[PDB]
Amino acid sequence: PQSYFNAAAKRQKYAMKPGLSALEKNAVIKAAYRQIFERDITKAYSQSISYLESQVRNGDISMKEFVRRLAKSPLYRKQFFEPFINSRALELAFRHILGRGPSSREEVQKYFSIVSSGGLPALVDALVDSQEYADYFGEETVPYLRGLEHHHHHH
């Protein structure tokens, strides 16, 4: 708070927006990994991570694609499906992408059909590319728990 004020703002929201320094962008990227994989991946987890890092640092790719790549990666595809089933992967995906679990029966069975046929990656595309969560929430906002998803398209 650069307006002469105590540290009341402890809940910070990361967003890929014009006006971010190197340290800021580093935290934004790392926070994304910490949210989707809900743990601190490092060392063994790199290379592709480092490559995605520089891409989003430049602002070359949208923060939305960064997220959809991670969730559609074999890592998430395995860790959240190998010791689970379609219905459980459904819950896990919803909780990570939308921040809300399947609430409505229609909702459950609707996306359950997607995760059963097209699979988890298809469920990812279905949830992430949702124009509702895209258009209304903004493309800059990092998807933290109870946060916002990113805007796809511009117009």
Swiss-Prot record:
<protein>
    <recommendedName>
        <fullName>Phycobiliprotein ApcE</fullName>
    </recommendedName>
</protein>
<feature type="domain" description="PBS-linker 1">
    <location>
        <begin position="1"/>
        <end position="148"/>
    </location>
</feature>
<comment type="subunit">
    <text>Heterodimer of ApcF (a variant beta-allophycocyanin). Phycobilisomes of this organism are composed of a two cylinder core, from which six rods radiate. The core is mainly composed of allophycocyanin alpha and beta chains and of minor components.</text>
</comment>
<comment type="similarity">
    <text>Belongs to the phycobilisome linker protein family.</text>
</comment>
<comment type="function">
    <text>This protein is postulated to act both as terminal energy acceptor (by its phycobilin-like domains) and as a linker polypeptide (by its repeats and arms) that stabilizes the phycobilisome core architecture. Has intrinsic bilin lyase activity.</text>
</comment>
